[PDB]
Nucleic acid binder design. Sequence first.
DNA 1: TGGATGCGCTGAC
DNA 2: GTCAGCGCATCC
Length: 327
Amino acid sequence: MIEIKDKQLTGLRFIDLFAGLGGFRLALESCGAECVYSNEWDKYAQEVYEMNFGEKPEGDITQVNEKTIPDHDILCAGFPCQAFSISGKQKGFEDSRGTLFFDIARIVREKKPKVVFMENVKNFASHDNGNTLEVVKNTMNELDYSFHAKVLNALDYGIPQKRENIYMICFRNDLNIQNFQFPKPFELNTFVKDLLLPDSEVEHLVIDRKDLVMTNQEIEQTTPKTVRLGIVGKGGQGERIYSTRGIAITLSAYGGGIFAKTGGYLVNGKTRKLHPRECARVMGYPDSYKVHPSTSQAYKQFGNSVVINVLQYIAYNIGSSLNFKPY
DNA sequence: TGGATGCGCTGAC
DNA sequence: GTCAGCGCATCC
Ligand SMILES: Nc1ncnc2c1ncn2[C@@H]1O[C@H](CSCC[C@H](N)C(=O)O)[C@@H](O)[C@H]1O
């Protein structure tokens, strides 16, 4: 994450729904905002959350009475994506994990915050011929909010990862916010090899598979794209090896393959997946963030998370728009 | 809501 | 045809 000198969100209160690692909390707090409520039902996510913020998030949002939720100015929610991701079965709203948005609508309808800041996977924008996004748009609209949605790639915001996600910013209508803008892309100057830990700390991640098939030549020049160098097995998910001179592939929560949830990388002649701390860095998390003691749970959490830097630039722009109140 | 890995199919070229 | 995906079902 980056440093924010102008705390655009000072004095504002927000809630952290589907909290996970608290990515939205880090981003909004760096802008001066105050978290007044968090909700996360996963046991291990709750532990790492408390480990970093000192509070245990409330469980199952579907069982929480929205009237009990504290007053807040900004509602943050990176809701479940398994049902909309290009990597899943795309059952969408028909999935028991695909209807969490209506819980968000329920909370908004009752708490009516100034802003609703949501995030989901790229395919969310195309799912069901665009009907899924349309439904969220109309729901927000009839809830009396404006709807700003756009898919941003983390590689355009200083993070070496081709992670694309849809960001949806909603302003209450009575606020007449007419100058909100998604952050503009800038040149990437950080690559995977810049975030890697020393070899001595990741030796245990070195995999020597005799079915490795290097398909491409290593590149000596850094590039803002993923560069596949080879595969193992059939080259499916978690079976692809990339260059550390390029950018990382999207970190995943339930990913499979020998290089599960991170992808494989060529590092000083050996192939290995990423270390939880490297996943943290690829997601824009500061080294001060405490990862979960279970590497398995940490991989799942970072793969489910958000890119801090991207949320910071957005949060900053949300605050800039809310603070523009000329006579 | 364990940890691990082989997998298959969709989306966007 | 190329290839990447906050995934999936199964195994222990
Ligand atoms: N019914 C429910 N109640 C509360 N939390 C839920 C939930 N269904 C899913 N979740 C939580 O929703 C999260 C979605 S992924 C969001 C991660 C978050 N942005 C962070 O930065 O890491 C998961 O952690 C999941 O456990």
